[PDB]
């Protein structure tokens, strides 16, 4: 009920990384994940271009697949929780995903 996750959501990389759905699909900037599963419902349509590498990047990456500078403060505000500490350095450099 009220664990940290109430708050701010503990996500794996690993968990983003099985990313072959629509709702199946997330971005980290750094230490936080975002909701990139309503993000692709917004402007492009297609989940194809951003869901094959979900959980690659979002600092600079979420413009590349997702809208233009808009998509900066557009992804921001999906802000869904935080990635793991451990997961995001793990799987860094992510071999099905980019």
């Known amino acids: 009920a009220e664990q940290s996750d109430k708050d701010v959501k503990y996500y794996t990389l690993e968990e983003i990384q099985k ?3 629509s709702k199946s699909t ?6 936080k994940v975002y909701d ?3 993000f ?3 402007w492009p349509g297609g989940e194809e271009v951003l869901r094959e590498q979900a959980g690659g990047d979002a ?3 979420f413009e590349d697949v997702g809208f233009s500078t808009d998509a900066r403060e557009l992804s921001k505000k999906y802000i869904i929780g935080e990635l793991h500490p451990d997961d995001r350095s793990k799987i ?3 071999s099905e995903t980019l």
């Open 19 to 21: 990313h072959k759905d």
């Open 26 to 31: 997330w971005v980290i900037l750094h230490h």
């Open 36 to 38: 990139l599963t309503k």
């Open 40 to 42: 692709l419902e917004e």
């Open 59 to 61: 600092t600079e990456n």
């Open 92 to 94: 860094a450099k992510p």
